[PDB]
């Protein structure tokens, strides 16, 4: 569950056991919120239960009335935050089928809004559903969202409830000053059974041996293990060591062979981000639970692109156009999605001589589009001789994507009179072709290098060709 | 070695390219040459020739508005000089030295229409008076010199 649009990036409650929802809706509050009259807050839980009583999860409006009669504000608002506790179902268990799931905390950054009550009500949930198998819960960051004796006491309570109930808890946090400034941490220490040194990154030291109560060579290792061999230390009981996970591993069937790394699905564990970005995205847009029936195609996918090229996309072409209503498919940052063209290809010629003020040679400019999407408008201009106000069009040759167009050229008073279409049997993709005339051209022709070096400035052809030589 | 390919440089007045080879250092260069001579006045029924003008094949130079300026409104370029040497060798003998006279830009080609993805641009020119100066272009690097002139007029 990462960060997204608004849409359902939490999980909500069921705010209607009336047994239960007094309690849930109490510590919902309290953690949405953290400030009241202190006086009869049951009597506002039961009140909003008989107001949601209706059927279910009204509207923020209602919710708000009834809860009144900054946590109301800020369900106003709802900024970035659609997965609350009110007015949504529990989309962890919509997970139900496969119960694994995490959550980006760059909205739960924001305690006590939107980190505390549905993180409170969620590990509520999971704990109290002791579905038998092993459970995990994995923290880095903790003290931003967790900042009350509210989870010191979980951690007293139910923590020990699920600790015979296969719960375990993996904070891999930062640097030890986040652990040392909150005491339930310390609390947390005293029940963490294991320690895991996974890096020497940027962190506070000296006071590690403090709680933790490693020896001067354990401190040492500890200091001088570094960070990107991504090898760890380990100590449990009173013990430790300096282990790893093999990353330098490999398939030695033979004598030794090629040495892949593990490097096929570690893609998942390492998590490259515009890989990420690609296959979270094919995913969201494929189905809203995610099980792996597409991953592995999505994976070969994403081998496949890692191995041409990283984030390349191309940066070879580039020929696209605005003619009044229709617009480029354009990969550059000029237009999107809707029309790609096919390519350079037109010329003006001169007969004469004056050497043994030009001549005229009654010409027309043309052009050539895929399939359309915006027909009739240029259907009517091509029938009425409707000059559009610009005809601009963009084109730059290899050396990237999103450099200056190698030509700007855009046409003035463009009067439409002829259009080729088609069609047949084998029609995939129809092209068809303007050939028309116009007022002006201006044409900015830059002599752009193979480098990316524009020397020099880009040499104008901006003169009207409709009655007039053009300079 | 280097290889084994042509050596073809011109410079038409401040024309000039983006080409970076040895010996074409932001020089013009060409991937095609059209140009051939017909005389119709032969009996199988001084210079009275028929109309014969210039044209070629160039990569992309980085004056070209500058060119359609000058075809729109009829500015030639004095001189255009040319070398081409054959394959075997970029700094071998020029086997070949080529001057035109008032040369004026007759067309260009490639941009507009979707016909040519990234092919170089065909473009013809009209002279007063052409004279190129021949080495043998034998298969060969170093071989013998001497040139072989013609120089020729519009008239």
Not at 13 to 24: D, R, V
Not at 347 to 373: E, P
Request: charged share 25%; hydrophobic share 35%.
């Amino acid at each position: 569950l990462p960060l997204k649009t608004g849409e359902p990036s939490g999980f909500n409650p069921f705010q209607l056991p009336p047994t239960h929802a007094n309690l849930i809706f109490l510590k919902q509050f309290v953690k949405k919120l953290a400030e009241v009259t202190h006086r009869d807050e049951e009597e506002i839980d039961q009140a909003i239960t008989a107001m949601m009583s209706d059927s279910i999860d009204k509207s923020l409006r209602r919710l708000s009335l009834l809860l009144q009669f900054h946590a109301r504000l800020v369900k106003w608002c709802e900024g970035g935050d659609y997965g609350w506790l009110f007015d949504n179902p529990t989309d962890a268990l919509d997970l139900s089928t496969h119960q694994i799931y995490g959550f980006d905390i760059t909205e739960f950054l924001d305690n006590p809004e939107a980190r505390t009550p549905v993180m409170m009500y969620l590990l509520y949930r999971t704990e109290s559903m002791i579905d038998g198998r092993r459970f995990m819960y994995v923290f880095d960051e903790f003290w931003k969202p967790l900042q009350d004796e509210y989870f010191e006491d979980l951690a007293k309570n139910k923590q020990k409830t699920i600790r015979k109930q296969n719960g375990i808890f993996v904070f891999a946090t930062q640097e030890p000053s986040d652990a040392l400034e909150s005491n339930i941490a310390k609390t947390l220490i005293q029940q963490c059974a294991t320690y895991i040194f996974l890096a020497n990154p940027k962190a506070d030291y000296e006071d590690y041996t403090q709680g933790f109560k490693l020896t001067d060579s354990e401190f040492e290792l500890v200091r001088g293990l570094g960070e990107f061999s991504r090898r760890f230390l380990i100590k449990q009981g009173d013990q430790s060591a300096l282990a790893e996970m093999n990353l330098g591993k490999f398939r030695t069937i033979v004598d030794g062979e090629t040495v892949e790394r593990d490097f096929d699905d570690e893609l998942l564990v390492l998590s490259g981000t515009p890989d990420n970005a690609e296959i979270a995205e094919s995913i969201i847009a494929e189905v809203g639970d995610d099980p792996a029936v597409w991953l592995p195609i999505f994976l070969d996918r994403v081998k496949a692109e890692r191995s041409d090229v990283g984030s390349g996309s191309g940066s070879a072409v580039d020929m696209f156009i605005k003619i009044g209503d229709v617009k480029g498919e354009s990969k550059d940052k000029t237009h999107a999605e809707e029309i790609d063209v096919l390519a350079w290809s037109w010329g003006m010629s001169q007969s004469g001589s004056m050497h043994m003020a030009g001549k005229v040679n009654v010409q027309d400019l043309s052009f050539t589009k895929y399939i359309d999407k915006s027909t009739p408008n240029l259907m009517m201009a091509c029938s009425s001789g409707k000059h559009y106000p610009q005809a601009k069009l963009t084109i730059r040759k290899a050396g990237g994507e999103n450099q200056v167009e190698y030509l700007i050229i855009t046409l003035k008073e463009v009067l439409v009179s002829s259009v080729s279409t088609g069609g047949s049997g084998g029609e995939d993709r129809l092209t068809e072709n303007v050939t028309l005339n116009f007022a002006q051209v201006q044409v900015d022709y830059q002599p752009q290098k193979a480098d990316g070096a524009k020397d020099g400035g880009p040499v104008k052809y901006g003169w009207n060709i409709r009655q007039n030589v053009q300079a």
